[PDB]
Amino acid sequence: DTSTLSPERVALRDELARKSRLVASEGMRYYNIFWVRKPLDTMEKEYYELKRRGVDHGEAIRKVLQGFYSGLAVKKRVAAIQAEEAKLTGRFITMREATVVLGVLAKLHKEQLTPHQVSLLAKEQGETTQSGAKLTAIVSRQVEVKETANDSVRQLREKAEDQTGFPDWYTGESPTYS
Amino acid sequence: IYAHALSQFAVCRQPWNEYIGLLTKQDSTPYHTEPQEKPAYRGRKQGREGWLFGQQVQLHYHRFPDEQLITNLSRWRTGETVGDIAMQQFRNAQPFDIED
């Protein structure tokens, strides 16, 4: 049991891992995957290249870390683009609807619902989803305020219609059919 | 004199120690840990003891990079350890260097 790493290499990799926990844990995670490339190894290689190019220790470390962060930013930008594209389809869920699902589960748990009760809940929730109203009115009893409306597919349709109610609003060079 | 034309090619030996030290290692830990003192042969009548407190073995918590996965193989297959923390952070934990 004699490590092949020189003390200089040990200090360098320890400093890199202390500055960034992403580079250290990315290669290993739960168990060392020995057949894949290691980001820490790539960072050390780039640091050595900068050192022989003429950049000293701190500036080389900062530059290589900034390059790694630029790569991670590219990855996250791609992830965000794909996330928007997928969530536009409507079959993908984020936290804003995961909280709704958790609330439904909490409602089912805290008050016990019979099969008839849960079926009625499902039917009424489907009705409110399909034909949900907009600008709900609350009476003073007199005085009514049009606010506090939840999302619905008919609301999506009316906002696609530019809040006009007429599906004919775009007049920019649209092809015709006889 | 004659090396003027030879130096134009300027083919030189490529690094190898750097390549060996930077290629992927089967046993690599995210944080390097200093190995603990191994027991030594104190004498004929004493035997083999460590210098710190007369231990018979080397102080360690985890020696291999995969014992946590071996222990939690069933959980790993079931996917319970997708975001676990105890295995993720304490896989390579080692005892504190307690000596003067």
């Binding site: - | 030189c12 030996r13 690094p15 190898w16 120690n17």
Partner: peptide, 29 residues
């Protein structure tokens, strides 16, 4: 010590790298 094992380092030479340019450039001290 004047007796050396098979897997033990010998006495290091005292110098008191500069002279390893002709050898592998990445070879440390």
């Amino acid at each position: 010590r004047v007796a050396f094992d098979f897997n033990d380092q010998l006495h290091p030479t005292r110098i008191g790298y500069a002279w390893f340019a002709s050898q592998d450039p990445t070879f440390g001290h």
